[PDB]
């Protein structure tokens, strides 16, 4: 998509109108606050999704009840379910809850025998 007229617009002609061009997108040194604000699951959205994972299990919910409250399309709901949790608890629930115990009443401390 482009504009081509070259008849109705021959009065004011200019190449740059702002303090940026190619000197920022090619050469950046500000890795602090990226623009990730594109519906990437905030807080209310978990109170729909994970609230449902607490109610019916993982797979006994439907995509319609998600899309009605999250305002995603049904096909985004259908894939988002398996995309966040394909097996449930990232399949890690096979060892935790019946194997972890305290030894020296400490956690994430240096312990290399």
From TrEMBL:
Domain of life per record: Eukaryota
Name assigned to this protein: MatB protein
Taxon lineage: Eukaryota, Amoebozoa, Evosea, Eumycetozoa, Dictyostelia
Name of the gene encoding the protein in the UniProt record: matB
């Amino acid at each position: 998509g482009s504009h081509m007229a070259s008849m109705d617009q021959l009065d004011e002609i200019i190449e740059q109108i702002q303090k940026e061009a190619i000197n920022s997108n090619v050469v950046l040194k500000n890795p602090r606050v990226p623009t990730q604000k594109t519906g990437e699951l905030s807080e209310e959205q978990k109170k729909i999704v994970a609230d449902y994972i607490s109610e019916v299990g993982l797979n006994n919910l439907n995509a319609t009840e998600l899309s009605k409250r999250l305002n995603i399309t049904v096909d985004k709901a259908k894939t988002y379910i398996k995309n966040s949790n394909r097996m449930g608890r990232t399949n890690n629930f096979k060892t935790i809850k019946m194997f972890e115990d305290d030894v020296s009443s400490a956690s994430a401390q240096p312990n290399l025998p």
